[PDB]
Design a protein around this ligand. Structure first.
Ligand SMILES: *[C@@H]1O[C@H](CO[C@H]2O[C@@H](C)[C@@H](O)[C@@H](O)[C@@H]2O)[C@@H](O[C@@H]2O[C@H](CO)[C@@H](O)[C@H](O)[C@H]2NC(C)=O)[C@H](O)[C@H]1NC(C)=O
Length: 403
């Protein structure tokens, strides 16, 4: 729910001298936003789901053929019409058979014949569309308030500390305002109608396994089908074989499962987990404007930490040109502001990078408080310095790269 630790991280600054920022979020990816006099926040794309899809087609894969009748008519007695023909559920084929003495007619010629049998669908396969209305994006936001190596990740700890927050965004409610305790609030205005069209490639469930299938291919499947809101099965003949016409009894059977031929014709297609009527999505992005007018800094009245700090390990490189490190304070002088910055040479009176953990704080009155800091040191050699004069400590950093 936090940027720290992700490869997929971006850095943004609010337009010099304005409050809001435009971004576009991407799957499993994170954005750290920095504004003069406001705390740093992280916006992150937790999850993007299409739920409650529309059922497009439906396709039968194993069928049953039942109650076979066949009406027969002697030569010159005209065309036989099996009465089962009035039945929506039955399926019928006219034919022609040699008849005569040897088999029931008083004349020799081609007698008529008409065969009906009932069609049932054992199991089926459903294709579904991803209309854009079905999309929900889930966004976490995190304020860079006092945090610890231990606690920076602990999602619960942050929520408790009025510091994290998970909300969703959908065309139904494209906007949200997350209140963040005394940090004020951040409002988000997004525009979900991004990436996916209303009618491309379908989602098709064959028994257990659900697939991302070529739309066009699904429509041409040579199987029986029922549309959206009805179980009437059209184009059934594809799964039933009508055998040789025996004068008395013609045989009508079902073809066995097609399940195998399908998992086969999809061996290569993109598999999707469709548990509980929703679909994880890996593509997709969201445009938002993130308004920070009402995001405030908190406790600027507090004094600067008067006592000595300590480094708790070599500062570590995040791999985005920023460093993370963890102080440990020694004093007990209430909560106070941490005197950390980055200077080009040790005696330097003004600083050189920027803090990412803007406005860092010892937030307790007990001894040995820890604070995590992430800062962006400048290119080349510099010292990270914490403290004033006698109690100053420091650590050197080189950052490679020119531009
Ligand atoms: C989120 O944090 C909580 C509790 O936070 C406490 O963790 C302590 C180890 C300590 O440093 C203290 O300062 C801090 O407030 C974790 O949940 C549980 O914490 C209790 C102690 O309060 C322990 O008995 C358990 O180890 C622990 N239970 C669990 C969930 O395993 C929790 O670990 C953490 N979130 C994560 C990353 O799981």
């Amino acid at each position: 729910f936090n940027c720290l630790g992700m490869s997929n991280r971006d850095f943004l600054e609010g337009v010099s001298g304005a409050t809001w920022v435009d971004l576009v979020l991407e799957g499993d990816s994170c954005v750290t936003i920095m504004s003069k006099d406001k705390p740093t926040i992280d916006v992150k794309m937790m999850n993007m789901e299409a739920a409650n899809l529309a059922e497009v087609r439906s396709y039968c894969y194993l069928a049953t053929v039942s109650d076979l009748s066949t009406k027969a008519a002697c030569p010159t007695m005209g065309e036989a019409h099996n009465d089962k023909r009035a039945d929506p559920a039955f399926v019928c084929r006219q034919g022609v058979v040699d008849r005569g003495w040897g088999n029931g007619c008083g004349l020799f010629g081609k007698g008529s014949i008409d065969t009906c049998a009932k069609f049932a669908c054992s199991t089926k396969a459903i294709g579904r569309t991803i209309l854009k209305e079905n999309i929900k994006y889930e966004v976490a936001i995190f304020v860079h308030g006092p945090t610890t190596v231990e606690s920076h990740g602990n999602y619960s700890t942050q929520v408790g500390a009025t510091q994290a927050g998970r909300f969703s965004i959908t065309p139904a409610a494209p906007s949200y305002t997350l209140k963040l305790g005394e940090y004020g609030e951040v409002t988000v205005d997004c525009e979900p109608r991004s990436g996916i069209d209303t009618n491309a490639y379908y989602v098709m469930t064959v028994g257990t396994k659900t697939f991302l299938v070529h739309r066009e291919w699904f429509m041409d499947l040579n199987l029986p089908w029922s549309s959206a809101g009805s179980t009437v099965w059209r184009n059934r003949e594809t799964l039933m074989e009508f055998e040789e016409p025996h004068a008395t009894k013609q045989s009508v059977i079902a073809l066995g499962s097609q399940e195998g031929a399908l998992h086969q014709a999809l061996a290569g297609a993109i598999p999707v987990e469709f548990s509980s009527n929703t679909v994880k999505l890996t593509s997709g992005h969201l445009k938002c404007r993130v308004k920070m007018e009402k995001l405030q800094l908190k406790g600027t009245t507090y004094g600067v930490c008067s006592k000595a700090f300590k480094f708790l390990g070599t500062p570590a490189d995040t791999g985005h040109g920023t460093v993370v490190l963890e102080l440990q304070y020694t004093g007990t002088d209430g909560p106070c502001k941490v005197p950390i910055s980055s200077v080009a040479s040790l005696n330097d009176l003004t600083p050189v990078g920027r803090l990412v953990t803007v406005n860092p704080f010892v937030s307790v009155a007990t001894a040995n408080a820890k604070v995590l800091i992430e800062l962006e040191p400048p290119f080349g050699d510099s010292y990270i310095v914490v403290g004033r004069g006698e109690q100053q400590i420091n650590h050197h950093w080189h950052k490679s790269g020119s531009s």
